[PDB]
Amino acid sequence: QVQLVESGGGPVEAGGSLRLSCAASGRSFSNSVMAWFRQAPGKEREFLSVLNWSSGRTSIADSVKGRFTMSRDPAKITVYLQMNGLKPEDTAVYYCAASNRGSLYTLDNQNRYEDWGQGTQVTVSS
Amino acid sequence: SHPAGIILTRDSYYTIPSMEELARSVDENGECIVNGFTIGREGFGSIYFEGIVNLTNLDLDSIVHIRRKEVIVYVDDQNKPPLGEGLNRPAQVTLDEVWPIDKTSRSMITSPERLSEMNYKSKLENASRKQGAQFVDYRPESGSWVFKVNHF
């Protein structure tokens, strides 16, 4: 059973930056796909970014393209979400998700990922 | 989107088992695992990986580049995984339509007789040795340079 542990959230001034971390453990992730999602109160979960572990290639959702980037430390089996120019509407719970499986779903779909972190709150104060 | 998560979309690239067969090969654990894997490109060459290879979610479009007289497996070292994982493992490379240039007309030399006179095969063998690869063959009919590596 896989464990995904987000960290790095919390309050941040508007205009500032934050880097979220997610440490993955429990099995080999050599053939995984990992993603960041967020969920604001009363809204559906929103896809932010995906990383393909075999190549390291990433893709960012248009809503945050140019502000958010995704990266990893392969050694530490950790992925990162770099959020710049933060705005009040970025306030949400941020989740890391992973799959070690093929799927009929596209990578932007929450159903693509069998495993999920507990979520970490990010609060952008004006 | 491919049921095994494999990303391979470029013209003339193909796999053995075929991408269509791999789409039918996802197991109960959602993985696509084969014994013996080829990734090829018509007109350029192919790479054969013996043994058990996990293909699930393999981003072949990013990882594998089969060019004229060269393959690239992992474009940078930062994203090359540990030895034995992914495609960083023993392989036999075949590069097709590899022929020397005739200094007179700058035209390709494809005659097996001429290729023997000039011992082209030993140019490719020297090149393999310098690269740390094991020379296997040069087949002049198809211009096929074959060599083996322990990893990429």
Author numbering:
A (entry chain A): 3 to 128
B (entry chain B): 715 to 866
Sentences from the paper on this structure:
In order to better guide cysteine placement in the nanobody framework, we solved the crystal structure of the anti-Nup98 nanobody TP377 in complex with the globular Nup98 NPC anchor domain (residues 716–866) at 1.9 Å resolution. TP377 contacts its target through all three CDR loops and does not block the absolute Nup98 C-terminus, which anchors Nup98 via Nup96 or Nup88 to the NPC scaffold. We next mutated solvent-exposed small residues (Gly, Ser, and Ala) at six alternative positions of the nanobody scaffold to cysteines. Moreover, cysteines on all six positions on our model anti-Nup98 nanobody TP377 could be quantitatively labeled with maleimide fluorescent dyes. Importantly, competitive binding assays indicated that the introduction of ectopic cysteines and their modification did not impair binding to the Nup98 target. Based on the crystal structure, we estimate that fluorophores attached via an N-terminal cysteine or A75C to anti-Nup98 nanobody TP377 can be as close as ~2 nm to the target Nup98. A competition for antigen-binding revealed, however, no affinity difference between reduced and disulfide bond-containing anti-Nup98 nanobodies. As expected, we observed by differential scanning fluorimetry a decreased thermostability of fully reduced anti-Nup98 and anti-Nup93 nanobodies. Their melting temperatures of 47°C and 57°C are, however, still well above any reasonable incubation temperature for downstream applications. The nanobody TP377, raised against Xenopus (x)Nup98, does not cross-react with human Nup98 and served as a negative control.
Nanobodies represent antigen-binding domains of 'heavy-chain-only' camelid antibodies and are typically selected by phage display from an immune library. NPCs are gateways for nucleocytoplasmic transport. The scaffold is bound to the nuclear envelope via transmembrane Nups and further anchors FG-repeat nucleoporins (e.g. Nup98 [red] and the Nup62•Nup58•Nup54 complex [brown]) within the central channel, where they form the permeability barrier. We chose the Xenopus nuclear pore complex (NPC) as a model target and developed a toolbox of high-affinity nanobodies against its major constituent proteins, nucleoporins (Nups), which occur in large subcomplexes.
